Amino acid sequence: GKDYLYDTKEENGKIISKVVFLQENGLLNKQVRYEFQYNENGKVSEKKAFRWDRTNDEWVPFYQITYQYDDQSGEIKTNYGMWDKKKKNFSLNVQNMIIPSTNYEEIFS
């Protein structure tokens, strides 16, 4: 079965990072690391996700989402890109999607 151990760092009131460990059949492995940055209004502006590379034991960038907010829309506009290991940017498989504002807290995984 799957259980999860979460390690969350907060600076004052804001989550800055979260690591998810997968617990499965008595094993414990790093699964994903999230890092968060915030706009001037204190809302999340950027989420970066890292994979755990077991060949080298290091966090490697995986994807990046940026978030834009609108007064009247009730909607958050998100722009996602995957890490391109040659270009060293998030230019692969770029896609846009809308999150309802009511699901804001789910950004923190």
Coordinates of C-alpha atoms in Angstrom, one line a residue:
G1 CA 0.0 0.0 0.0
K2 CA 1.1 3.6 -0.1
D3 CA 1.5 6.0 2.9
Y4 CA 3.1 9.4 2.7
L5 CA 5.5 11.3 4.9
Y6 CA 5.5 15.1 4.3
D7 CA 8.2 17.5 5.4
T8 CA 7.1 21.2 5.1
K9 CA 9.2 24.3 5.7
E10 CA 7.5 27.6 6.4
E11 CA 9.2 31.0 6.7
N12 CA 6.8 32.9 9.0
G13 CA 3.4 32.4 7.6
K14 CA 4.3 31.0 4.1
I15 CA 5.2 27.6 2.9
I16 CA 8.6 27.7 1.2
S17 CA 9.2 24.0 0.5
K18 CA 7.5 20.7 0.8
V19 CA 9.1 17.2 0.4
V20 CA 6.9 14.1 -0.2
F21 CA 8.3 10.7 0.8
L22 CA 6.6 7.6 -0.5
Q23 CA 6.3 4.8 2.1
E24 CA 5.5 1.5 0.3
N25 CA 6.0 -2.1 1.5
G26 CA 8.3 -1.1 4.2
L27 CA 10.5 1.1 1.9
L28 CA 11.0 4.9 2.2
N29 CA 11.9 7.0 -0.8
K30 CA 11.9 10.6 -1.8
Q31 CA 9.2 11.2 -4.4
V32 CA 8.9 15.0 -5.1
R33 CA 10.1 18.4 -3.7
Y34 CA 8.1 21.5 -4.2
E35 CA 9.5 25.1 -3.8
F36 CA 7.2 28.2 -3.7
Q37 CA 7.6 31.8 -4.4
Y38 CA 5.1 34.6 -3.7
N39 CA 3.9 37.9 -5.3
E40 CA 3.6 41.2 -3.6
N41 CA 0.1 40.3 -2.5
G42 CA 1.3 37.3 -0.7
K43 CA -0.1 34.8 -3.1
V44 CA 1.9 32.0 -4.8
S45 CA 3.5 33.2 -8.0
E46 CA 5.7 30.2 -8.8
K47 CA 5.8 26.5 -7.9
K48 CA 8.8 24.4 -8.9
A49 CA 8.7 20.6 -8.6
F50 CA 11.9 18.5 -8.4
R51 CA 12.3 14.8 -8.9
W52 CA 14.7 12.7 -6.8
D53 CA 17.5 11.3 -9.0
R54 CA 18.6 8.0 -7.3
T55 CA 21.6 7.6 -9.7
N56 CA 23.2 10.7 -8.2
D57 CA 21.0 11.4 -5.0
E58 CA 20.0 14.9 -6.0
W59 CA 17.0 16.9 -6.6
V60 CA 16.6 17.7 -10.4
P61 CA 14.1 20.2 -11.7
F62 CA 11.0 18.6 -13.2
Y63 CA 8.4 21.3 -13.9
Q64 CA 7.5 24.9 -13.1
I65 CA 4.1 26.5 -12.8
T66 CA 3.5 30.3 -12.7
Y67 CA 0.2 31.8 -11.4
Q68 CA -1.7 35.0 -12.4
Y69 CA -4.7 36.4 -10.4
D70 CA -7.6 38.5 -11.5
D71 CA -9.9 40.6 -9.2
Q72 CA -13.3 39.7 -10.8
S73 CA -12.8 36.3 -12.4
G74 CA -12.8 33.8 -9.6
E75 CA -10.1 32.1 -11.6
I76 CA -6.4 31.6 -11.4
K77 CA -4.5 31.5 -14.7
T78 CA -1.6 28.9 -14.6
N79 CA 1.3 28.4 -17.1
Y80 CA 3.2 25.1 -16.8
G81 CA 6.4 24.0 -18.4
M82 CA 8.7 20.9 -18.0
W83 CA 12.4 21.2 -17.5
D84 CA 14.5 20.8 -20.6
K85 CA 17.8 19.2 -19.5
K86 CA 19.7 20.5 -22.5
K87 CA 18.3 24.1 -22.6
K88 CA 18.2 24.5 -18.8
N89 CA 14.8 26.0 -18.8
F90 CA 11.1 25.1 -18.5
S91 CA 10.3 25.2 -22.2
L92 CA 9.1 21.7 -22.8
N93 CA 5.4 20.8 -23.1
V94 CA 4.2 24.3 -22.2
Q95 CA 0.5 24.5 -21.4
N96 CA -2.0 26.9 -19.8
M97 CA -4.8 25.9 -17.5
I98 CA -7.3 27.6 -15.1
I99 CA -7.9 26.7 -11.5
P100 CA -10.9 28.0 -9.7
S101 CA -9.9 30.4 -6.9
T102 CA -11.7 28.2 -4.4
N103 CA -9.1 25.5 -5.0
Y104 CA -6.2 27.9 -4.2
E105 CA -4.9 25.8 -1.2
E106 CA -4.5 22.8 -3.4
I107 CA -1.5 24.6 -5.0
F108 CA 0.5 23.6 -2.0
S109 CA 0.0 19.9 -2.6

